[PDB]
Design an enzyme around this catalytic site. Structure first.
Site, PDB file in Angstrom:
ATOM      1  N   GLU C  46      -5.626 -22.453  11.052  1.00  0.00           N
ATOM      2  CA  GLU C  46      -6.774 -23.072  10.526  1.00  0.00           C
ATOM      3  C   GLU C  46      -7.557 -22.451   9.367  1.00  0.00           C
ATOM      4  O   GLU C  46      -7.775 -21.066   9.391  1.00  0.00           O
ATOM      5  CB  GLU C  46      -7.792 -23.248  11.656  1.00  0.00           C
ATOM      6  CG  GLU C  46      -9.043 -23.787  11.716  1.00  0.00           C
ATOM      7  CD  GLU C  46     -10.056 -23.676  12.722  1.00  0.00           C
ATOM      8  OE1 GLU C  46      -9.888 -22.602  13.472  1.00  0.00           O
ATOM      9  OE2 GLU C  46     -10.814 -24.694  13.127  1.00  0.00           O
ATOM     10  N   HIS C  83     -14.682 -11.105  15.196  1.00  0.00           N
ATOM     11  CA  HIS C  83     -14.796 -12.488  15.816  1.00  0.00           C
ATOM     12  C   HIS C  83     -15.399 -13.157  14.806  1.00  0.00           C
ATOM     13  O   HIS C  83     -16.621 -13.368  14.889  1.00  0.00           O
ATOM     14  CB  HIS C  83     -15.626 -12.358  16.996  1.00  0.00           C
ATOM     15  CG  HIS C  83     -15.962 -13.841  17.713  1.00  0.00           C
ATOM     16  ND1 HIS C  83     -17.230 -14.454  17.649  1.00  0.00           N
ATOM     17  CD2 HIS C  83     -15.196 -14.812  18.068  1.00  0.00           C
ATOM     18  CE1 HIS C  83     -16.730 -15.689  18.061  1.00  0.00           C
ATOM     19  NE2 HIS C  83     -15.725 -15.982  18.424  1.00  0.00           N
TER      20      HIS C  83
END
Ligand code: SF4
Ligand code: MG
Ligand code: MG
Ligand code: MG
Ligand code: MG
Ligand code: MG
Ligand code: MG
Ligand code: MG
Ligand code: MG
Ligand code: MG
Ligand code: MG
Ligand code: MG
Ligand code: MG
Ligand code: MG
Ligand code: MG
Ligand code: MG
Ligand code: MG
Ligand code: MG
Ligand code: MG
Ligand code: MG
Ligand code: MG
Ligand code: MG
Ligand code: MG
Ligand code: MG
Ligand code: MG
Ligand code: MG
Ligand code: MG
Ligand code: MG
Ligand code: MG
Ligand code: MG
Ligand code: MG
Ligand code: MG
Ligand code: MG
Ligand code: MG
Ligand code: MG
EC number: 3.1.-.-
Lengths: 122, 208, 84, 84
Positions: C46, C83
RNA sequence: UAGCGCCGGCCAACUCCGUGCCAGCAGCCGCGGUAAUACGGAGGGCGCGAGCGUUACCCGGAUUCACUGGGCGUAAAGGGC
RNA sequence: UGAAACUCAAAGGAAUUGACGGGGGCCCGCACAAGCGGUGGAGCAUGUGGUUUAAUUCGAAGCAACGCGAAGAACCUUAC
RNA sequence: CGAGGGUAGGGCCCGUGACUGGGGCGAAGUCGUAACAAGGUAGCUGUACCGGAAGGUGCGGCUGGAUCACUUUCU
């Protein structure tokens, strides 16, 4: 509607469509593989599903899924189509049947042996 | 055809005694009297309330495993009974009790229905003078059923008939123990045939 | 298809070392996958957004991702522990 | 700084990754040694000549060596398991 | 001679280990990123049995073309008059 | 007037709870307003980001992390 | 008379097919802010013009619009 309308027009039948265009409902069809490939599925999940493009006797060229773990498929392999779509793979409306043609069965499988074409060991 | 293998799993499974062994089914070495909780390592765990279909299936399997018959014969007899006049459940029980292997067990020639099936399968039983080999014979009313004269020594049936005197046979049956021959007078009734089942549930099950 | 690493990527790779080898094997799995299929394959390839434009990201875990980029015969890796 | 692995440089790395982790630890320590200083450190920093000009070689064991080069604020690594 | 399918719900039958959004399952809903009753074996259980599963086709369920038995303000549907 | 291939496990109607509004009405708190000092300037103390080091042990992250775990690090404490 | 064949003309279908037109599924790609709260100029609709694009505007209609009567991106 009024009864006279049903007298004139009448009720239309449903006229169901064919989900599997395997030449007038033949259950299975012999075909030859052209391209073996791994294809990324749709997006509620992710894997590397084995897909083989098969050109068969009716002159049609359609994709097919290979169940089970591993195979022996090549770019020139006589196979037998099964029918039955797969949700995560768009464009794939069929399945391949392991066990009888150039496509071999599944090595070391003991639970559902009739499926995936594996004989009784020992 | 006949279900072979373990038989005590069954009385333990339905939770109701089926007496599919005979003499041991009155002994204290009975499966249920020893262990009534179902088998399969999850018997001690409590049972969740089953579905309605589960109750129907358990009673159907209970009644089918009473006589030890195949499902294909069972459903055929069921459809033969229902499409017939009269209350389908009791006449279904009547057709099931009119089996030859059942009536030789009911006449007490054998101790178990399977032993009875083995006896009629070997031609040890005759009806009206003619020997028959199959347990699926539809016994008609007034049929003179007996053991063959050529198989009259037979230590097993001698000890069975020896223990048979003193006991009472069903009201729709008559038996000459010394002459070793019974008579099928009438079709049984549900009151004349006490079974730990609810036939209405079987009717509900096959009507799906 | 040469490999290119950053300083924070390698430092976090050492952070993955001596702690849990399963993450390390997952990294190697993603490396061989991207060497075979750079823009497809496992780990749900992605791309990213407004600040990180021109790169790609793959799902290592349900909490951690892998940031990378591919030039002709070149594969740059950065941020193996963050993250997004 | 930047770190660079070659295509053949990862096979021996994964080879040592599944056989002996101790050697891998000495490898990470010498990479940290080169990270603190370019031309100095552990492993007798010595350059090579014409066939491998501009590249140097470090010691991990006497049977295995390290071919490298430093420029563009980056570290290039050719092989780590053989003499050359 | 005993085999075949299944054991998350629909739908009857549960546990451990292996696996780790990989390998995979899958009719629909959807499981898998370290305690997976769903993947893969094992044990155990359920259904049927010389059969047991799959594919294809027809009817049913489908009152989902409604004669028995549907509707039309806002869900599709009142025709501009 | 008016399709099909292909594709989806929904699209949709009303209504309930809540959240939201650069929607309204009513009302609190140093939330503004009024006022007094104060930070941000400078020197220093402490904590943190970053950089370097072999190590600068680790955690903590806006309100609600940063004179915080530390109400006591020269070695001990200490895990680097 | 007549199966059939030939010439010319007309129509229809199938297959291939240079060049094209749009569509649907997938990727947190890019550029925007159209719409949901008065979406920040209320929205929707027929038509006409214009515009990288959603869309802006004119004319008329509807309420399935609100409330008492500068402009401010995206996650
Ligand atoms: S009583 Fe007889 S038939 Fe019943 S479980 Fe015991 S052995 Fe089996
Ligand atoms: Mg009747
Ligand atoms: Mg019926
Ligand atoms: Mg169940
Ligand atoms: Mg399965
Ligand atoms: Mg199906
Ligand atoms: Mg555990
Ligand atoms: Mg597990
Ligand atoms: Mg879980
Ligand atoms: Mg299942
Ligand atoms: Mg399993
Ligand atoms: Mg149907
Ligand atoms: Mg109908
Ligand atoms: Mg009607
Ligand atoms: Mg309707
Ligand atoms: Mg509408
Ligand atoms: Mg409407
Ligand atoms: Mg009107
Ligand atoms: Mg609504
Ligand atoms: Mg409210
Ligand atoms: Mg204040
Ligand atoms: Mg003030
Ligand atoms: Mg002061
Ligand atoms: Mg001031
Ligand atoms: Mg200050
Ligand atoms: Mg100290
Ligand atoms: Mg002619
Ligand atoms: Mg607008
Ligand atoms: Mg207009
Ligand atoms: Mg235009
Ligand atoms: Mg345009
Ligand atoms: Mg204008
Ligand atoms: Mg207007
Ligand atoms: Mg509105
Ligand atoms: Mg108004």
């Amino acid at each position: 509607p009024t009864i006279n309308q049903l007298v004139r027009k009448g009720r239309e039948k449903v006229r169901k469509k064919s989900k599997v265009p395997a030449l007038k409902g033949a259950p299975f069809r012999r075909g030859v593989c052209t391209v073996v490939r791994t294809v990324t599925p749709k997006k509620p999940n992710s894997a590397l599903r084995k897909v083989a493009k098969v050109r068969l006797t009716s002159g049609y060229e359609v994709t097919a899924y290979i169940p089970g773990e591993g195979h022996n498929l090549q770019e020139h392999s006589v196979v037998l189509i099964r029918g039955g779509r797969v949700k995560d793979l768009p464009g794939v409306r069929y399945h391949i049947v392991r066990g009888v043609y150039d496509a071999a069965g599944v090595k070391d499988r003991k639970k559902s042996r009739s499926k995936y074409g594996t004989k009784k060991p020992k | 055809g006949r279900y072979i293998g373990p038989v005590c799993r069954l009385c333990r499974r339905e939770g109701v005694k089926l007496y599919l062994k005979g003499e041991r089914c009155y002994s204290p070495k009975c499966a249920m009297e020893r262990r009534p909780y179902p088998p399969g390592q999850h018997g001690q765990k409590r049972a969740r309330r089953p579905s309605d279909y589960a109750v129907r299936l358990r009673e159907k399997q209970k009644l089918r495993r009473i006589y030890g018959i195949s499902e294909r014969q069972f459903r055929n007899l069921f459809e033969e009974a229902s499409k017939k006049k009269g209350v389908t459940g009791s006449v279904f029980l009547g057709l099931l009790e009119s089996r030859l292997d059942n009536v030789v067990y009911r006449l007490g020639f054998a101790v178990s229905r399977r032993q009875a099936r083995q006896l009629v399968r070997h031609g040890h039983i005759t009806v009206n003078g003619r020997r028959v080999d199959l347990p699926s014979y539809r016994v008609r009313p007034g049929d003179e059923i007996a053991v063959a004269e050529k198989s009259r020594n037979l230590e097993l049936i001698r000890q069975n008939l020896e223990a048979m005197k003193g006991r009472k046979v069903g009201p729709w049956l008559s038996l000459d123990v010394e002459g070793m021959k019974g008579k099928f007078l009438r079709l049984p009734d549900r009151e004349d045939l006490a079974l730990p089942v609810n036939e209405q549930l079987v009717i509900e099950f096959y009507s799906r | 298809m040469k490999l290119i690493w950053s300083e924070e990527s390698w430092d976090d790779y050492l952070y993955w070392q001596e702690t849990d080898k399963r993450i390390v094997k997952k990294i190697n799995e993603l490396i061989k996958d991207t060497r075979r299929t750079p823009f497809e394959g496992k780990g749900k390839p992605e791309p990213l957004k407004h600040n990180l434009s021109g790169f790609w990201s793959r799902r290592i875990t349900e909490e951690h991702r892998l940031v990378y980029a591919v030039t002709d015969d070149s594969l740059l890796i950065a941020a193996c522990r963050y993250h997004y």
